Amino acid sequence: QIQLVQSGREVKNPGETVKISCKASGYTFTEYPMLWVKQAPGKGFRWMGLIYTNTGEPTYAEEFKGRFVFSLEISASTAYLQINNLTNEDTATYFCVRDYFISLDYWGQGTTLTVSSAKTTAPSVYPLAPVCGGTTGSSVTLGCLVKGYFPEPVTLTWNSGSLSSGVHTFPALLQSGLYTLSSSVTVTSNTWPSQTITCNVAHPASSTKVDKKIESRR
Amino acid sequence: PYIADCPNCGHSRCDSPIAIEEVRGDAHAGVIRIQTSAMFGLKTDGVDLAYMSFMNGKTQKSIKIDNLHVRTSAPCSLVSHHGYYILAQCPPGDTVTVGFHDGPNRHTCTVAHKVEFRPVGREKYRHPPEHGVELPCNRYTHKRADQGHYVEMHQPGLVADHSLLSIHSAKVKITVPSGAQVKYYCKCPDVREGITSSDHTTTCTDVKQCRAYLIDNKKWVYNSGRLPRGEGDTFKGKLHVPFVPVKAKCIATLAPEPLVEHKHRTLILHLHPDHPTLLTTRSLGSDANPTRQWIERPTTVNFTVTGEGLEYTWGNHPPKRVWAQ
Amino acid sequence: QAVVTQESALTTSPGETVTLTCRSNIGAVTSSNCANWVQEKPDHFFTGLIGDTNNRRSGVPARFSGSLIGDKAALTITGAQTEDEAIYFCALWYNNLWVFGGGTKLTVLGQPKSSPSVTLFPPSSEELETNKATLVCTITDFYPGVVTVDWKVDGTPVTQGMETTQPSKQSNNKYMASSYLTLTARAWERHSSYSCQVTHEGHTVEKSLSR
Amino acid sequence: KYKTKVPSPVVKCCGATQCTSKPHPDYQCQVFTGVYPFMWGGAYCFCDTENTQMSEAYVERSEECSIDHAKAYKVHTGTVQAMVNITYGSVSWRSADVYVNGETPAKIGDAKLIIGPLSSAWSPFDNKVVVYGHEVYNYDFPEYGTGKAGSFGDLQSRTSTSNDLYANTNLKLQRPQAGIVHTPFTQAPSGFERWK
């Protein structure tokens, strides 16, 4: 019914601008305005303002009057947050939210911004296959290591997303100035290596797409 | 919910959110349409007309309507509220006197306004009865689904709030509501506009010589005379009126029937009304020779009826007619 | 210019009744504050529970009810469930803006413990072609969500080279984490026995590779 | 009856704000100094005589003007009518609307009938007439554009839609008292209030 799906997470060096979209589904856009909330890493939840999706007038919280600008692609049921002249302390997650029932009833997924200086490094995608010997159980765990990229984000799927059950994707972590991510997938021992299992990785900032099929070590 | 300066706010001139402007005792049905500067109705967000949002602080308080009181010479009867605006059935009164009860405090507002309620009809009652004829009165609606007029409602100007101007242990310290736009400087030379988060004040020290302002134009207001202009612009915010004056047929007046008595080309009429009744006639000759007199005291009257006829109007009771040959 | 305050953390057991409160620094909370309650489950997952003090969002179990108790807004979970373990935030309206509380972390007894599923992978060969080798140790489906990961190259506790992520909550409400041990193509070829040891709710699991 | 729908006055805190004669009907506006306007925090303008207050008020049609409104007319003679029944002869029926001008037939039924012109040209309406809802007054209304304030026709709008009008209401703003925000509008209640 109601889905507010947000854009993916960006990386931006200080000074830049970002436009975060919120695409609304399930309600009539026009009778319910949008709340923009900032949940800062430590600090907790904060109201950034509200936009009248009918007239188009924004209210900003005083903390947010200035670099922040709400707007909407009415026509497509999108509300957008734009933060100009990005300050380093704006790294946090921003949620769109529907104001209804004397409060807020639905929250989006969040779009996380990491304001940070750094060039652009494409990831190296490495297959993780089991040890050279044996590996005999009722199931089997394969993996995919996405190493050394910048900036965030990368997306990772298994078999173009048709294999989602039994998957653990591990949050990217910064190490020596670069991000590293990994994912595991577990399937029955009959599936692999009988049927092909492929790691799909995209790094938008570098226009890098890598498809890596997990092959047996021998 | 706008806040303005009530004139005799219990003690004297306070600043009540329910500051009464535009009293309209101009209809007939015992009703007055009023505007509070407070916007009761739904809450801040979305629910239940029968809740209650006035301004406390810079802030609203969107809660229950529990103990509203409009009143005049006597306590009125609410009819309906919508927006800034309430309709209430009142008796006549030299003044108008409004007020709810938040619960900790009475917190009322009162005003002068000449009120009367003539019903439509040649009877000058003081009050609508249970019976009588219906006829075309002027009156306001119960409802909200209403567009017949709209009043300009653009932004608020700033407002004072010296709760902001605290002290930074030697300097006067302004803060902000939510990142709102605080327009600031002091008599001394320091920051001269103020479009900021919480500032300090390098130069001046005294709270009593500084600009505690709130440009908080995220929500428009009614354009009360007791509003300071938002100097920037005529922002948008054309906004309807609910309580349009409509052509209701009030349940309305009727005066007791006359006692018709015959004489030679003459109507003696022993007469005995309930209230002051405007009687009048028209001797149907091209000589009209009409008569008018409000009758409240019972009176035996007379009418030299002619050959061709006369007519007779006992209040809004229908006109009679008479052959006196 | 108002401060909403909430309990920091509350612990209950499945089947109990627990009350969370929301206090305003300016005065009693009233119906014109339109108390809202929002729940945050792991993964930045937000849902609204109650609005306008006591209106339950649609599709929120009835075990959840809101009210004003004394001078504060309250959320009562009647028959708390294991699934209710999350962060609950209250929001209060103040005539022109919203102020959110700090949130209450609620813990509910349930979800029987679960041992981790550990897997250690060898450096792939395309990576050994870079003059680098990274042993990945993945640990998933463990609960409670706290582990100790220790690496041991050739019998000797490695102590530099490793990085272990922080336990992240999976969907089923169990946790996961991975640890990396980066060697050089060369360090790789030198030593011969690698092992990733994971300690969880007292049992140990060692996964060793042999080059 | 008018409605003094006051636009919200300006308050410049230190120095003058000259007013201009906006084209609103009877746009009364008068600058005022020497205030100290108590607005929710005590006063707010930090000066004490340079505190300036510009009051402005114009006249506007009431909402009742659309519906509860007197109505003037210049009345000429026109042409009189009738729903003449004739239950004729053996025809026994025709109830037809006719005229008076002495060459108009009305072939409704079967008979052709020519009426008048009547000799009794007394139009009971006078030349000038005011009209109100149902009570019609053969009143010498002063005119559009002229009506003395308080007297009938202080407000004079051509029609209800007509944004332009003539508002001689003698609307005179006075300075607000003792450093408080409000708008003294001193005005005659309407010559539509009286006249009722």
One DSSP character per residue, A29-44 reads GGGS-EEEEEEETTTE
Which residue, C12, C70, C60, is CA-closest to C36? C60
Contacts of residue A87, defined as CB under 8 A and 6 or more positions apart, other chains included, come to A14, A67, A115
The dihedrals phi and psi of A208, each to the nearest 5 degrees, come to -100, 125
Q: Are D8 and B223 in contact (CB under 8 A)?
A: yes
Contacts of residue B7, defined as CB under 8 A and 6 or more positions apart, other chains included, come to B13, B110, B111, B112, D182
* Type and span of the H or E element at C128: helix C125-128
DSSP state of B50: T
Contacts of residue A203, defined as CB under 8 A and 6 or more positions apart, other chains included, come to A122, A123, A149, A154, A209
Give the Cβ contact number of residue A124 at 10 Å.
19
Which residue, B102, B120, B46, B106, is CA-closest to B71? B106
* Type and span of the H or E element at C190: helix C185-190
Q: Residue for token digits 């008292």?
A: D177
Among positive and negative, which fits the CA dihedral D91, D94, D98, D100?
A: positive
Residue D194, CA distances (Å) to A154, B88, B136, D3, D191 in order: 80, 24, 20, 15, 5
Quick check: D6 contacting B, CB < 8 Å? yes
Amino acid sitting at position A145: L
Residue B53: closest C-alpha in chain C: C32
Report the alpha-carbon distance of residue B301 to residue B307 in Å, rounded: 19
Distance of alpha carbon A75 from the chain centroid: 24
Q: How far is C63 from chain B (nearest CA, A)?
A: 23
Contact call for C100 and A104, based on CB within 8 A: no
* Residues facing C199 on adjacent strands: C148, C204
Residue A68: closest C-alpha in chain B: B179
Report the alpha-carbon distance of residue C89 to residue A39 in Å, rounded: 11
CA torsion angle D172 D175 D180 D181 (round to 10): 40
Q: How far is A74 from chain C (nearest CA, A)?
A: 23
Q: Are C94 and B60 in contact (CB under 8 A)?
A: yes
Distance of alpha carbon C126 from the chain centroid: 35
Buried b (16+ CB within 10 A) or exposed e, B7-45: bebeeebbbbbbbbbbbbbbbbbbbbbbbbbbbbbbbbb
Buried b (16+ CB within 10 A) or exposed e, B173-187: bbbbbbbbbbbbbbe
∠ CA C194-C196-C198, rounded to 5°: 160
Half-sphere exposure of B84 (CA within 13 A, CB side): 28
Residue B64, CA distances (Å) to A201, B42, C34 in order: 55, 10, 11
Mutate to test the interface with C, among A4, A6, A45, A175 (most CBs of C within 10 A): A45
Contact call for D40 and B26, based on CB within 8 A: no
Mutate to test the interface with C, among B61, B166, B221 (most CBs of C within 10 A): B61
Contacts of C48 in chain A (CB under 8 A): 97, 101, 103-107
- List all chains that touch chain D, counting a touch as 3 or more CB pairs closer than 8 Å: B
Residue B248, CA distances (Å) to B28, B244, D137 in order: 10, 11, 23
| A37, A102, A147: residue with CB nearest C55 | A102
Contacts of A103 in chain B (CB under 8 A): 45
Among positive and negative, which fits the CA dihedral B41, B44, B47, B53?
A: negative
Distance of alpha carbon B291 from the chain centroid: 37
Q: Are B91 and B73 in contact (CB under 8 A)?
A: yes
Residue B191, CA distances (Å) to A65, B204, C34, D68 in order: 18, 10, 37, 55
CA torsion angle B310 B311 B314 B319 (round to 10): 160
Report the alpha-carbon distance of residue B186 to residue B210 in Å, rounded: 4
Report the alpha-carbon distance of residue C111 to residue C116 in Å, rounded: 14
> In this structure, what token pair is assigned to residue D13?
């805190």
Q: Residue for token digits 């609620």?
A: C106
The dihedrals phi and psi of C187, each to the nearest 5 degrees, come to -55, -40
Contact call for A105 and C48, based on CB within 8 A: yes
> In this structure, what token pair is assigned to residue C116?
């981790």
In this complex, whether C and A touch, counting 3 or more CB pairs under 8 angstroms, is yes
Report the alpha-carbon distance of residue B85 to residue B26 in Å, rounded: 16
Q: Residue for token digits 């309406």?
A: D125
> In this structure, what token pair is assigned to residue C24?
């305003």
The bridge status of strand C9-12 relative to strand C104-108 is parallel
Which residue, A135, A77, A118, A80, is CA-closest to A206? A118
Q: Are D49 and D32 in contact (CB under 8 A)?
A: no
Plot region of D124 (φ>0 → left; ψ -120 to 50 → alpha; else → beta): alpha
CA torsion angle C77 C83 C87 C91 (round to 10): -50
∠ CA C100-C105-C109, rounded to 5°: 150
The bridge status of strand B150-152 relative to strand C117-121 is unpaired
Longest dimension (CA), chain C: 71
Half-sphere exposure of B313 (CA within 13 A, CB side): 17
Q: Are C32 and A101 in contact (CB under 8 A)?
A: no
Report the alpha-carbon distance of residue B299 to residue C159 in Å, rounded: 118
Which residue, A135, A103, A122, is CA-closest to A217? A135
Question: Integer distance in angstroms from the first to the last C-alpha of chain B?
Answer: 70
Report the alpha-carbon distance of residue B38 to residue D46 in Å, rounded: 28
Q: Are A83 and B242 in contact (CB under 8 A)?
A: no
Residue B55, CA distances (Å) to B119, B186, C36 in order: 37, 27, 20
Resolution of the experimental structure, in angstroms: 7.3
Quick check: B179 contacting A, CB < 8 Å? yes
Contact call for D66 and B157, based on CB within 8 A: no
Q: What is the 3-state secondary structure (H, E, C) of A161-196?
A: HCCCCCEEEEEEEEECCEEEEEEEEEEECCCCCCCC
Q: Are D131 and D70 in contact (CB under 8 A)?
A: yes
Q: Residue for token digits 């309990």?
A: C7
Residue C197, CA distances (Å) to C118, C179, C206, C208 in order: 9, 10, 4, 8
Half-sphere exposure of D166 (CA within 13 A, CB side): 13
DSSP state of B207: G
Q: Residue for token digits 């940070």?
A: A116
Report the alpha-carbon distance of residue B93 to residue B114 in Å, rounded: 7
Residue A42: closest C-alpha in chain C: C102
Contacts of residue D33, defined as CB under 8 A and 6 or more positions apart, other chains included, come to D16, D49, D50, D51, D52, D53
The dihedrals phi and psi of C84, each to the nearest 5 degrees, come to -80, 5
Residue C42: closest C-alpha in chain A: A109
Q: Are B105 and B62 in contact (CB under 8 A)?
A: no
Report the alpha-carbon distance of residue B85 to residue B93 in Å, rounded: 20
> In this structure, what token pair is assigned to residue C76?
């009562």
Q: Are D2 and D60 in contact (CB under 8 A)?
A: yes
Quick check: A110 contacting C, CB < 8 Å? yes
Q: Which of residues 44-73 of A touch C (CB under 8 A)?
A: 44-47, 59, 61-62
∠ CA B136-B138-B142, rounded to 5°: 110
The dihedrals phi and psi of C189, each to the nearest 5 degrees, come to -65, -20
Contacts of B163 in chain C (CB under 8 A): 1
The dihedrals phi and psi of D103, each to the nearest 5 degrees, come to -145, 5
Q: Residue for token digits 């005799």?
A: B8
Contact call for A61 and B179, based on CB within 8 A: yes
Q: How far is B105 from chain A (nearest CA, A)?
A: 25
* Residues facing A34 on adjacent strands: A51, A98
Report the alpha-carbon distance of residue A165 to residue D107 in Å, rounded: 91
DSSP state of C114: B
Amino acid sitting at position C176: M
Quick check: C26 contacting B, CB < 8 Å? yes
Quick check: C33 contacting B, CB < 8 Å? yes
* Full DSSP string of C77-97: EET--GGG-EEEEEEEE-SS-
Buried b (16+ CB within 10 A) or exposed e, C120-140: bbbbbeebbebebbbbbbbbb
SS3 state of residue B125 = coil
SS3 state of residue C125 = helix
Which residue, A48, B179, A39, A90, is CA-closest to C102? A39
Number of B:D CB contacts under 8 A?
96
CA torsion angle D140 D145 D151 D156 (round to 10): 100
Report the alpha-carbon distance of residue B152 to residue B239 in Å, rounded: 6
Report the alpha-carbon distance of residue A100 to residue B18 in Å, rounded: 27
Residue B207, CA distances (Å) to A44, B14, B212, C52, D181 in order: 33, 22, 9, 38, 21
Q: Are A46 and C92 in contact (CB under 8 A)?
A: no
Quick check: A93 contacting C, CB < 8 Å? yes
Q: Are D9 and D55 in contact (CB under 8 A)?
A: yes
SS3 state of residue A62 = helix
The bridge status of strand D2-3 relative to strand C55-56 is unpaired
Q: What is the 3-state secondary structure (H, E, C) of chain D?
A: CEECCCCCCEEECCCCCCCCCCCCCCCEEEEEECCCCECCCCCCCCCCCCCEEEEEECCEECCHHHCCCEEEEECCCCCCCECCECCCCCCCCCECCECCCCCCCCCCCCCCCCCCCCCCCCCCCCCEEEEECCEEECCCCCCCCCCCCCCCCCEEECCCCCCCEEECCCCEECCCCCCECCCCEECCCCCCCCCC
Amino acid sitting at position D93: W
Q: Where are the beta strands (DSSP E) in chain A?
A: 3-6, 10-12, 18-25, 34-40, 44-51, 58-60, 68-73, 78-83, 92-100, 103-107, 111-115, 124-128, 139-149, 155-158, 167-175, 178-188, 198-203, 208-213
Report the alpha-carbon distance of residue B203 to residue B210 in Å, rounded: 11
Helices (DSSP H) in B76-179: which residue ranges? none
* Residues facing B125 on adjacent strands: none
Q: Are B17 and B37 in contact (CB under 8 A)?
A: yes
> In this structure, what token pair is assigned to residue D84?
């003449």
Which residue, C14, C182, C35, is CA-closest to C106? C14
SS3 state of residue C185 = helix
* Residues facing B54 on adjacent strands: B61
